[PDB]
Design a protein around this ligand. Structure first.
Ligand SMILES: *[C@@H]1O[C@H](CO)[C@@H](O[C@@H]2O[C@H](CO)[C@@H](O[C@@H]3O[C@H](CO[C@H]4O[C@H](CO)[C@@H](O)[C@H](O[C@H]5O[C@H](CO)[C@@H](O)[C@H](O)[C@@H]5O)[C@@H]4O)[C@@H](O)[C@H](O[C@H]4O[C@H](CO)[C@@H](O)[C@H](O)[C@@H]4O[C@H]4O[C@H](CO)[C@@H](O)[C@H](O)[C@@H]4O[C@H]4O[C@H](CO)[C@@H](O)[C@H](O)[C@@H]4O)[C@@H]3O)[C@H](O)[C@H]2NC(C)=O)[C@H](O)[C@H]1NC(C)=O
Ligand SMILES: *[C@@H]1O[C@H](CO)[C@@H](O[C@@H]2O[C@H](CO)[C@@H](O[C@@H]3O[C@H](CO[C@H]4O[C@H](CO[C@H]5O[C@H](CO)[C@@H](O)[C@H](O)[C@@H]5O)[C@@H](O)[C@H](O[C@H]5O[C@H](CO)[C@@H](O)[C@H](O)[C@@H]5O)[C@@H]4O)[C@@H](O)[C@H](O[C@H]4O[C@H](CO)[C@@H](O)[C@H](O)[C@@H]4O[C@H]4O[C@H](CO)[C@@H](O)[C@H](O)[C@@H]4O)[C@@H]3O)[C@H](O)[C@H]2NC(C)=O)[C@H](O)[C@H]1NC(C)=O
Lengths: 204, 59, 48
């Protein structure tokens, strides 16, 4: 199931998150607070469970399923997963949608790229780290390139985390061989935030 | 209704991981629901493991 | 083939088989017994 990576809204506004790949009505959505267990906020599409506010509503149109949260509040900040029965008895889950009700204001990310050190190359290892921080929303994709052609190997990216200033931050780790590092002069790191991208490049 | 997980938090590779759930407030005999597991790798999505039920049919 | 009066259509015709025919009859409803109490001493079994 395909769930949007991120979602944002101000308190009182209404957010509608979608899900696709559901041919049946068994669609259900879950809410998981960070450092806690997931909780089912909806089941059998629109139907609500016990102790769940009316503002949560499930909907499915065609092959697309949708959840709607109106009247946003602090406690609505979490990761939202969707799931449904498929075929005979197997069940699958989406990637989940991260909805944040954190405080203002929006901001462009900040990238600082560090090439491998002299002591690191001695271990016959080469690692480049992109440091991205101070961005809103808290979901950002990172891409790597060598000279021109993109680099699809050695990419380790982790989920961003909120800072003391309430701005999110993330770091991507690229581990390769020293041979391809010295051969290729420049290594580019592309960081995509809300359509607009921020790039950095380093050469020995 | 409370579900309490128990077992080794640290297991070595290639070995056998064993976990046991202790239910409280409900019977496993009940045919109203299935019982199983769902694991969530660190900073990742929810993946279905499996479930079973002794409440059977004629075959 | 057995019949009381054969040419007579008013009489039933009894047939005896050679090989037995496998037949399955099941109750594809898994039920429970209420065992309600209409006492003193009596208990009726309702279909749950
Ligand atoms: C139709 O719907 C029915 C429900 O409405 C449903 O009935 C349920 O069926 C399951 C599956 O059998 C039952 O679970 C069993 O529970 C047994 C203990 O039951 C007692 O305790 C329960 C808890 O309090 C009570 O609920 C239960 O009451 C029931 O029975 C009353 C009459 O006795 C009746 O009045 C009630 O209304 C109610 O119906 C009762 O008081 C438990 O012992 C049993 O485990 C064995 O059986 C399983 C198969 O049935 C096996 O899969 C399982 O592995 C166990 O077998 C092993 O253990 C046995 C001894 O415990 C040995 O004899 C076996 O040989 C075997 O041992 C070998 O294997 C082991 C490994 O597996 C090994 O370690 C050993 O060394 C050895 O090698 C079972 O879990 C449930 O209680 C039923 N009732 C309800 C309400 O759910 C029914 O299934 C549906 N379908 C059909 C077709 O009817
Ligand atoms: C078990 O089941 C079986 C069947 O499942 C039962 O069998 C049934 O038995 C009864 C007997 O109780 C039969 O009825 C009797 O039929 C005879 C014979 O009738 C046939 O032949 C007649 C003559 O045929 C010859 O002649 C012509 C002309 O030359 C030739 O072309 C032929 O080839 C022959 O050579 C013919 O006249 C009949 O036709 C008439 O009747 C039929 C049937 O109703 C009609 O369709 C026709 O259109 C036509 O009208 C027939 O082809 C009859 O003779 C019997 O009549 C006696 O009984 C009557 C009461 O039912 C009574 O009113 C009559 O007067 C007559 O009684 C006379 O005879 C007695 C004996 O001699 C005398 O005592 C009496 O005083 C009087 O003189 C009778 O109708 C059934 O046909 C037969 N079922 C079938 C399908 O055929 C059996 O009973 C069961 N048993 C048990 C224990 O359960």
């Amino acid at each position: 199931l395909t769930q949007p990576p991120s979602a944002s809204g101000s308190p009182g506004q209404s957010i509608t998150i979608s899900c696709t790949g559901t041919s049946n009505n068994f669609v259900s959505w879950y809410q998981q607070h960070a450092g806690k267990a997931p909780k089912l906020v909806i089941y059998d599409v629109n139907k609500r469970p016990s102790g769940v506010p009316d503002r949560f509503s499930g909907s499915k149109s065609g092959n697309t399923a949708s959840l709607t949260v109106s009247g946003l509040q602090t406690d609505d900040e979490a990761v939202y997963y969707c799931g449904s029965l498929v075929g005979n008895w197997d069940v699958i889950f989406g990637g989940g949608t991260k909805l944040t009700v954190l405080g203002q204001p929006k901001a462009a990310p900040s990238v600082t790229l560090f090439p491998p050190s002299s002591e690191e190359l001695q271990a016959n290892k080469a690692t480049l780290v992109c440091l991205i921080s101070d961005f809103y929303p808290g979901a950002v994709t990172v891409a790597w390139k060598a000279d021109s052609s993109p680099v699809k190997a050695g990419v380790e990216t982790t989920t961003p985390s909120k800072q003391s200033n309430n701005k999110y931050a993330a770091s991507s780790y690229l581990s390769l061989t020293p041979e391809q590092w010295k051969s290729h002069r420049s290594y580019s790191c592309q960081v995509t935030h809300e359509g607009s991208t921020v790039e950095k490049t380093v050469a020995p | 209704p409370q579900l309490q997980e128990s077992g080794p938090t640290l297991v070595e590779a290639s070995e056998t991981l064993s976990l046991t759930c202790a239910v409280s407030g409900d019977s496993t005999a009940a045919c109203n629901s299935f019982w199983g597991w769902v694991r969530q790798p660190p900073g990742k999505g929810l993946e279905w493991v499996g479930s079973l039920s002794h409440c059977a049919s004629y075959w | 083939i057995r019949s009381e009066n054969i040419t007579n259509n008013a009489k039933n015709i009894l047939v005896q088989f050679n090989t037995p025919v496998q037949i399955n009859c099941t109750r594809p409803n898994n039920n429970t017994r209420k065992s309600i109490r209409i006492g003193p001493g009596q208990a009726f079994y309702a279909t749950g």
